[PDB]
Amino acid sequence: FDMPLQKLREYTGTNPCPEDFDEYWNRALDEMRSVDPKIELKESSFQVSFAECYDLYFTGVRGARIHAKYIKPKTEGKHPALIRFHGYSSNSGDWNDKLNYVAAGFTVVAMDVRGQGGQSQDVGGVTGNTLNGHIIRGLDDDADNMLFRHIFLDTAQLAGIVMNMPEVDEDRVGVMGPSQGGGLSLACAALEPRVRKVVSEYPFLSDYKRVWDLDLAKNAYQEITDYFRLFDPRHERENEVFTKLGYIDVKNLAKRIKGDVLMCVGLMDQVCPPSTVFAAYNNIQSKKDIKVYPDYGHEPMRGFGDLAMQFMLELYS
Amino acid sequence: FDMPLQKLREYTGTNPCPEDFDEYWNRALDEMRSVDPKIELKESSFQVSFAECYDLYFTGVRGARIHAKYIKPKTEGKHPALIRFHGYSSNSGDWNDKLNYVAAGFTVVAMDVRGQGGQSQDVGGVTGNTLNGHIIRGLDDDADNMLFRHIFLDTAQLAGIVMNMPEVDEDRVGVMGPSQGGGLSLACAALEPRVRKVVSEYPFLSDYKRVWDLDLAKNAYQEITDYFRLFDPRHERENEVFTKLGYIDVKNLAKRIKGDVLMCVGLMDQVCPPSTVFAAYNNIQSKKDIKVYPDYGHEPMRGFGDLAMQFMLELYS
Amino acid sequence: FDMPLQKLREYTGTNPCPEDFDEYWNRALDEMRSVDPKIELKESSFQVSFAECYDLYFTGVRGARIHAKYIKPKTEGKHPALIRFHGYSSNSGDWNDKLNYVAAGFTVVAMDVRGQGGQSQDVGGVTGNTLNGHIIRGLDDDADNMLFRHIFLDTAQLAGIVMNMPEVDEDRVGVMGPSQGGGLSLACAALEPRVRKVVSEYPFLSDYKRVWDLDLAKNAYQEITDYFRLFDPRHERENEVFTKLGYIDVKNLAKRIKGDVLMCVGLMDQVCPPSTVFAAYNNIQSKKDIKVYPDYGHEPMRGFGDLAMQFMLELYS
Amino acid sequence: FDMPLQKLREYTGTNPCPEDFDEYWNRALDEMRSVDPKIELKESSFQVSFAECYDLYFTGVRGARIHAKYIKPKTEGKHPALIRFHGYSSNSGDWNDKLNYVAAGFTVVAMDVRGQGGQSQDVGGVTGNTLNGHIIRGLDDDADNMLFRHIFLDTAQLAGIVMNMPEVDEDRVGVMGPSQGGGLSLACAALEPRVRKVVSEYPFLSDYKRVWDLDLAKNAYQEITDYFRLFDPRHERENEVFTKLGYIDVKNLAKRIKGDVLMCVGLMDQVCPPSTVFAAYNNIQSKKDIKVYPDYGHEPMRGFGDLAMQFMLELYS
Amino acid sequence: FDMPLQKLREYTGTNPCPEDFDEYWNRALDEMRSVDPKIELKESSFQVSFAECYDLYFTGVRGARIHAKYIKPKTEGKHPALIRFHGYSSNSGDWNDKLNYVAAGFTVVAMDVRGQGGQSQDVGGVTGNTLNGHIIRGLDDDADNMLFRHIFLDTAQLAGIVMNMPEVDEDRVGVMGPSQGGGLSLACAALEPRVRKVVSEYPFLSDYKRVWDLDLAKNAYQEITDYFRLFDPRHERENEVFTKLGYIDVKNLAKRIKGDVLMCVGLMDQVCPPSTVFAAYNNIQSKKDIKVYPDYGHEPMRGFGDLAMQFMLELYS
Amino acid sequence: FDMPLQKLREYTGTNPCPEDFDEYWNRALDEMRSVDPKIELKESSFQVSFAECYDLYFTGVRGARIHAKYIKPKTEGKHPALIRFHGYSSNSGDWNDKLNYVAAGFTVVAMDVRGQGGQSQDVGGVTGNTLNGHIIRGLDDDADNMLFRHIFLDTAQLAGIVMNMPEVDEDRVGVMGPSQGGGLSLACAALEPRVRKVVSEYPFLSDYKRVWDLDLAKNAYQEITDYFRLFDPRHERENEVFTKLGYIDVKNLAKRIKGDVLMCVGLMDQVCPPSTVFAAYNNIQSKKDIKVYPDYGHEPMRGFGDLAMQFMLELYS
Ligand SMILES: [Ca+2]
Ligand SMILES: [Ca+2]
Ligand SMILES: [Ca+2]
Ligand SMILES: [Ca+2]
């Protein structure tokens, strides 16, 4: 259902990239940097004796109150930190499974995406469809009002907040996540170049046009099809639509990443077509590597979790 | 998958009704009535020689700009009017198929629901999930900020606007729609008692708890399941959740309807369980009737469209 | 699952055309023209004040009694007429939705196909399979006894009957229909060259061999696969079978069409493959046009209905 | 999806039986007995040294030419005979697998059903639907014109023809078949009481109303649902329809069977619900027995074939 | 698809329990206790600085070499230990996600089931089917040769080995697992009463007969259906089959558990019917609790992971 | 989903062939030939008067007790014999349907494959997975311990046993089977060159790598995918795995076949891809022929059974 591996290795993407892409994002970062986070920490009901578990809240662009789990090991001195991002429609998950990295002495943070399955706020205020999908949310509004634009900014802002924590060495921060979380990991490391390590598992939010070309604009990408069916049935605004989506196409932000990257891709993945994953991978200029799993689809790949941790452990000296 | 027809005719609903239901709605109607609609009519690109086609815009509660197709026949004197409501995620549709009632001398209006498939605006500004579903949109916010509360008010406000049109006899306005449109038809006739005729085809938005009890909280009702899975996995707040959804349960509004009602239900419809449809039907106190289609599911039922027009044509003496 | 749009534009078909195709149809036309229609009109139970609704019955070839809905506006003088054809296994449908064109002053006729979901008779009398499918009905009999041959003749015969109606301007007649109805519309305009306008939506009954070549001989075209599995499992008579089906392949009749044609096609339509639709379209020699819907399948395409009406309204001076 | 075995044992049926059922069938038998079979035997291209293989053709009611495979062992004297009936839409099948009974010295005959997958003719000539299904074929016509009525007569007529074969002992004839073939076997033994043995495997064509009551009027019984959806959507003629189908309900003919009967039923069979099978079984008044297969559906049941042969071998002294 | 919660609470099971159940297991334990484990530890390629990761191998009954991951924290003194068991056809998984409990100072062990997805050996040597399923593996052989009998013994033996580790406090050992792993957790805590804590998530291997009664002997329990279809199609040995399966029905071993138990059940779980889960739960006599997730099926339930860890942390003083 | 018939006829396979293929098999044949079969014949409970039905047991390699149905006609002198092999997970089936060849004077033998649906024993004793699949059974053990290696030897040993039966003409033995039975037929005729006739219907166990390349390593070939997913997720040992599977790839054994071969293939068969079937066919050097069924999948093909018997009947002069 996608090109052979031989060609994936060379594929660099299909979705257009706005001509003012750089200006667009420099502007976005300016807005993010002018925000007063007014950070608040609340002790979680979940408690362990070897670490402090806090519910962290900060204000992002447009006044949205963002939430993230925050686990701090009870150890002296500064150390590495890991920021996890979750899948589409999910949330930061349970506290306990974040402790595997705390065991390694890491501070661990897991952010909730605005308006999805967690406790992060989506202030809305956009024109157009609001029933299904965040990718097309704000698509018929001004480009600067696209929801994933704010979400991407939240990850960048959170990375800076984490880097300012007293127990965190700002030069030893890594980000990780699967699918949407993998796309957000790339976006975060792109918008906050200080991020040192990046683990992106079968990333979502990449090379939109390609997904549509493969007749795969379904499942997680169904909203792109819904959009055209309802607002441009004969595709009279196709190029403008995909160009605008180019603003939130991680394959376009990929060139900004400075940290080391480790990715994985399942060749049976029809949710996030292998070609869209390689497009993001092939736009990365920093040190990188990608693990290929021929028989896996959009799912955790056996053994990769271990490769990812060993990769993250590289944050220590 | 549901109770026998024998029991259906006796079923009055399961979903709870808030203690302050009436005051909640009188309070909502007060808000709607205090809004300056600033009505604007723009000529449509679709034009015929026997009628006037206009895109109508008005401001609803919370400042949302609402859109509706508006077709006026080129005849003299006042006459009946029909207000159509559409299915979940859809829109007012095409202009041409609305002309069947125009041929009958009716003014035809088809409203687009906020943030769905048309041109009506959803101003948002709610806390909680915004990724999928309007039923749960605002569920974790104040009850007065629930999206379908505003949408229901839009239907009532539009009915009032239509009743003030120069060519419309305010005492001869009918409403109609399938699924979501069927629930909206009931809500509209309930909130604007002046509505004279009502056609509700396999109505959606009714008896939420019942849908869940039958393990049918999927398909169109999937979001109710996602809500619990993400925000209350062990149903510790079950009664509170369904009670709040009770505010937008059209079965609870039904008692207010004064116009004549004609409904249809498919006994194979698992999207809108027959019991939930009968629950709404059985709460109506005005003159009513329901057509039963044993072998039909969530779909147009052969012959009903004709029964619906003959029913609407009763508006003429 | 089909060639790219770029290639579809140049695709002219795969299914063969019998060497005696022309003589076959001229002989077929002679047979129908010799039939005494014995037309009878019966007032319908469905009635409105602005039009006359009649159930029309006429005798077609082989003594079959054919039925069609007939709506005549209560206006003065001659005017255009629209003849609608329905989907496979369906019928003429409801009376009310045909009134959109009556609003435009058109006489509207909707024919029921022999032995399908309506009230038209299939006298049968053929050898071979009679359990499933009209495409293969009479395939093992003489070619002059193939059921769709008679059905095509019914459309041409009905077109002439309509052109002889007192209120109908014989030079202002249009035909329209989706899927099977789209194929019948083409066949009608081909067998009755006086037809002025043609709207063919995702036409069925075209380029049979191509459907099979694409492994799409299922769904609506399943009977073709059943025929071979049961009567020619090793395809020893493949060319003979498809050539014979060529007699009722609308892409072969398309060359005879003189009226203007407006078609629509969904690129995700696997029921009527895009290539088979373009094959019919590319064989049309009269003024034509085709609307392409990239994200639509075998279903009504948003906005096309309005395009079709504006197209039909061109029949008025 | 059906009642427990405990209840199945006592279930006698739901579908009605016409008050003139008996006269209907006696009149039907008189018609077939007046037909001149004009039997013709043609040597088959398939030949073996130990038997004679012929394609047998005889004329049935309404002038239909019926076909059946006919294998005669090259032995001396009279012996038993087995008549096989096939599944819905299938045919008599291959010659070789019929030889298992020829090995036992049986003459084997396998009839093709009119207009299905074989070489038997369906003269048609009925009013109503002819697109899908033989159960509803002729349902809107006179009851004496229902297709399965003629097919049942074909089995009885064939049974008599076989009983008149020189090498066949008329008192040692057995009939067998699965699904449709199981229903035909029952009908045959009912209309031709001389039939000595009967093997009916998960019989189709039984207790129609029950199939519909269970919401299983799909798959093989789909046409019943199609009939109502198209010709009686609100079931205003429900009792009339099912009572008429009672003429061809094998559970109503079962009382006439005189030969011993061996049946089998799969409790997971949703195509032919267990209750409809037991309904036919429980109406049999002759020596009978039924093998129950808890984990089998609409399919051959392991070991039953051997039970069936040992049962048929009882025809030998 | 299963009884209401009200009745689940009281349901105690349906599958029989052999009369010599106790003798059978006392005998099995004797065989296990006579085995020389000949334990061998091999450093894993996966290494972290805060713990020792070893591949542990021991010999179980019948000479099978069993494998389990073994992670020991680099801390002084004795402490609690957790033994994880995996799902059907899976294995011990990755090393990294086991570190969440190591962070809590626990020694963590994850055993691979014989012949499944890991490195544990199944010496086989049984008669009967060996193609699919371990539940019926050895079912046609002597009861003492049933594979899950050995597997259960492996868990008990491993628990004793863990309790003998120098860094492990033998009175602070817990076991946990989902589905098959949940069934194995119950079996382990039953056969090694010293186990102090038990977390069983939607347990598999319980109340076999019940699964079959609900027509749910499919998916994970498909082999039970396969067995009957192939070896006892008419269920002539039904009681003997299910009674024999009673030897490895965890609901029967449940009464032996002494440690505290925490379980979870998804009411939408058709893989492990809620009733079979409550049957095991209701046979437990030690301190216990069960978390119900109405909208979850056979899958991890949000929040439970955290309840499970807090429950396990109860092992410390 | 596969290459065009034009290319199929030229395709010779993709799966590698071990360098020591021949010695591996000569070594295997040596082992089989050194086994004392200790043949035992037990009269079956199924008995007919024209043939002798016996359950035959013999010891194969590794001490496994193998079972086969054995039917001998009550005729004088030596005659042909037919050995049938069954489908994956199935068994020899019923006795009665084997009598068609008995009627032709043949002795008919139907072998049960070790550990599948019949009475043949799989002694096991292998390391690695034992939960699902015989193709990978023993794959992680020495190549000489692979299960299908022993099964292949069982077919060869049984052929030799049959050729020594007093009523059997050793030069007139044919083998036949579908799917797995088709692969076993080829393996048998390859390992026991004396086999005179071969019928292989849509053979399984051929060209493994090709199945994987087409993403068809599912359904019957699912275990190959499970193997990689669990034991080599990144395919680091891909060539080694497929090369080893090459030992039991019937396409590699095909070159040894001396008897005449007749095969059939369905072009819609995704279970046993057409290419893999043609790969085996194209490696045969003896007289051969293949029947192509374009519209058939993994299923019996109409008419082939008769071609198969006529082909086998060629054994008589
Ligand atoms: Ca480092
Ligand atoms: Ca004009
Ligand atoms: Ca006897
Ligand atoms: Ca404690």
Side-chain angles (χ1 to χ4, degrees), chain E residues 57-72:
Chain E
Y57 304 83
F58 69 98
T59 300
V61 294
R62 307 312 166 76
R65 199 63 174 157
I66 312 300
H67 169 274
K69 281 182 167 58
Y70 168 40
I71 310 173
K72 181 185 177 182

Side-chain angles (χ1 to χ4, degrees), chain C:
Chain C
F1 63 85
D2 209 322
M3 59 182 90
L5 179 58
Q6 304 70 65
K7 298 181 181 180
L8 293 171
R9 308 280 193 184
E10 298 291 319
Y11 180 64
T12 61
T14 301
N15 203 86
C17 182
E19 286 298 308
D20 65 343
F21 183 80
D22 285 349
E23 182 49 64
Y24 174 86
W25 279 109
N26 288 319
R27 182 197 315 134
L29 286 172
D30 286 353
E31 191 191 337
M32 90 84 161
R33 288 170 177 160
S34 71
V35 177
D36 177 340
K38 306 285 281 60
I39 302 174
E40 94 187 315
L41 296 179
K42 302 181 179 180
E43 293 179 54
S44 171
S45 56
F46 182 89
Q47 294 294 327
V48 289
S49 64
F50 57 91
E52 296 297 327
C53 299
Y54 305 112
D55 276 297
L56 181 163
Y57 303 85
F58 68 94
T59 296
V61 298
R62 308 310 166 80
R65 197 62 174 165
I66 314 302
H67 162 276
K69 281 182 165 59
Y70 168 39
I71 308 182
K72 173 180 179 174
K74 288 183 178 180
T75 59
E76 293 289 351
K78 272 169 150 50
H79 47 67
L82 169 67
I83 306 184
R84 272 184 170 290
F85 297 115
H86 67 74
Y88 200 27
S89 85
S90 193
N91 52 48
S92 62
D94 280 34
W95 293 88
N96 90 82
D97 60 70
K98 304 303 184 298
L99 297 173
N100 59 335
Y101 279 87
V102 173
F106 274 53
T107 263
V108 180
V109 182
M111 188 190 84
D112 280 340
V113 175
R114 303 191 179 202
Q116 288 189 19
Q119 310 311 308
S120 283
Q121 167 183 40
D122 167 15
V123 299
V126 297
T127 61
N129 183 278
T130 65
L131 179 56
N132 290 299
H134 278 175
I135 295 176
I136 64 171
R137 194 61 54 87
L139 185 57
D140 292 335
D141 204 305
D142 163 49
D144 288 12
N145 302 326
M146 287 168 76
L147 184 53
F148 266 116
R149 190 210 71 148
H150 312 324
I151 294 169
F152 284 8
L153 290 174
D154 290 336
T155 71
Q157 198 187 339
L158 178 58
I161 286 171
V162 172
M163 289 168 180
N164 274 325
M165 293 184 167
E167 83 287 3
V168 175
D169 179 331
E170 77 177 69
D171 297 307
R172 299 179 198 271
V173 177
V175 296
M176 183 179 160
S179 194
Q180 174 182 67
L184 291 177
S185 287
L186 293 171
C188 183
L191 299 174
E192 172 49 81
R194 277 182 295 168
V195 170
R196 193 70 189 73
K197 292 291 177 173
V198 186
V199 172
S200 187
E201 301 177 52
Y202 44 99
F204 179 60
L205 306 180
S206 169
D207 204 16
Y208 302 109
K209 180 61 163 57
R210 176 58 178 176
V211 176
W212 183 79
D213 287 337
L214 295 171
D215 287 340
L216 274 320
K218 43 188 170 63
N219 300 305
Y221 284 113
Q222 180 65 49
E223 67 201 80
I224 293 178
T225 290
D226 291 333
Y227 177 79
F228 279 106
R229 287 171 58 90
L230 294 164
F231 305 101
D232 186 31
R234 308 229 309 301
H235 285 229
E236 299 175 59
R237 304 182 291 107
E238 181 177 295
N239 184 55
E240 294 157 61
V241 171
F242 284 110
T243 301
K244 195 165 187 179
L245 289 179
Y247 287 119
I248 57 173
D249 183 334
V250 306
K251 90 175 191 307
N252 291 330
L253 285 168
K255 73 180 195 310
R256 301 187 172 212
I257 297 177
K258 303 327 304 168
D260 306 338
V261 181
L262 175 61
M263 297 184 53
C264 71
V265 57
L267 301 184
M268 299 306 285
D269 190 340
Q270 302 186 65
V271 178
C272 292
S275 58
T276 65
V277 173
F278 267 94
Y281 176 74
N282 290 327
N283 275 293
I284 295 174
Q285 302 178 301
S286 57
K287 190 179 200 300
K288 64 189 180 179
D289 190 31
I290 186 165
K291 318 313 293 192
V292 182
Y293 291 85
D295 315 298
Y296 284 73
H298 197 69
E299 62 183 308
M301 287 143 216
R302 293 182 187 284
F304 185 76
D306 286 350
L307 293 178
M309 176 167 281
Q310 286 304 323
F311 180 67
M312 285 291 171
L313 287 178
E314 300 187 350
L315 287 179
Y316 273 120
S317 289

Side-chain angles (χ1 to χ4, degrees), chain A residues 172 196-197 310-317:
Chain A
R172 304 176 190 274
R196 196 66 179 68
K197 290 297 184 186
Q310 288 298 321
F311 183 69
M312 281 299 176
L313 285 174
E314 282 175 33
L315 288 170
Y316 277 113
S317 282

Side-chain angles (χ1 to χ4, degrees), chain A residues 121-301:
Chain A
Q121 165 183 35
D122 171 13
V123 297
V126 298
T127 56
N129 187 275
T130 68
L131 176 58
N132 288 296
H134 278 173
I135 296 179
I136 62 171
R137 190 60 57 81
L139 184 58
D140 287 327
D141 199 317
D142 184 72
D144 293 2
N145 300 316
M146 291 172 77
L147 183 57
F148 264 116
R149 180 264 206 182
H150 311 323
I151 296 173
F152 284 10
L153 288 178
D154 293 332
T155 73
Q157 180 174 14
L158 179 58
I161 289 176
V162 168
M163 293 174 172
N164 276 321
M165 299 178 153
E167 84 281 10
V168 177
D169 182 320
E170 81 174 72
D171 292 323
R172 304 176 190 274
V173 175
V175 304
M176 172 173 60
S179 198
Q180 177 187 65
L184 292 179
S185 286
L186 296 171
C188 176
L191 293 168
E192 173 49 82
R194 286 185 293 165
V195 169
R196 196 66 179 68
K197 290 297 184 186
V198 189
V199 175
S200 185
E201 299 176 53
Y202 41 104
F204 179 58
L205 305 176
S206 172
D207 205 12
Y208 301 112
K209 179 74 161 60
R210 175 61 176 172
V211 178
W212 177 80
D213 292 337
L214 299 171
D215 291 332
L216 252 26
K218 58 185 176 65
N219 299 305
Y221 284 114
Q222 178 64 52
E223 67 198 80
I224 291 173
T225 286
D226 293 347
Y227 180 80
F228 278 105
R229 282 172 64 86
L230 297 165
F231 305 103
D232 189 32
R234 297 203 307 303
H235 285 228
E236 291 177 343
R237 304 181 296 112
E238 182 176 299
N239 186 54
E240 302 187 313
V241 173
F242 284 110
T243 295
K244 194 166 182 178
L245 288 175
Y247 287 119
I248 58 176
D249 182 341
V250 296
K251 94 178 188 308
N252 291 332
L253 285 172
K255 72 181 180 302
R256 300 187 171 207
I257 301 178
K258 312 296 289 182
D260 303 326
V261 184
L262 173 63
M263 294 177 56
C264 66
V265 57
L267 298 191
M268 296 304 280
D269 192 330
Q270 283 175 51
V271 179
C272 288
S275 57
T276 64
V277 173
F278 269 93
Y281 178 74
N282 289 322
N283 275 295
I284 293 177
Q285 302 183 306
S286 58
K287 187 269 188 171
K288 67 189 183 182
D289 289 293
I290 192 170
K291 303 303 166 183
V292 182
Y293 294 80
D295 317 295
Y296 284 76
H298 203 69
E299 63 186 308
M301 289 139 214

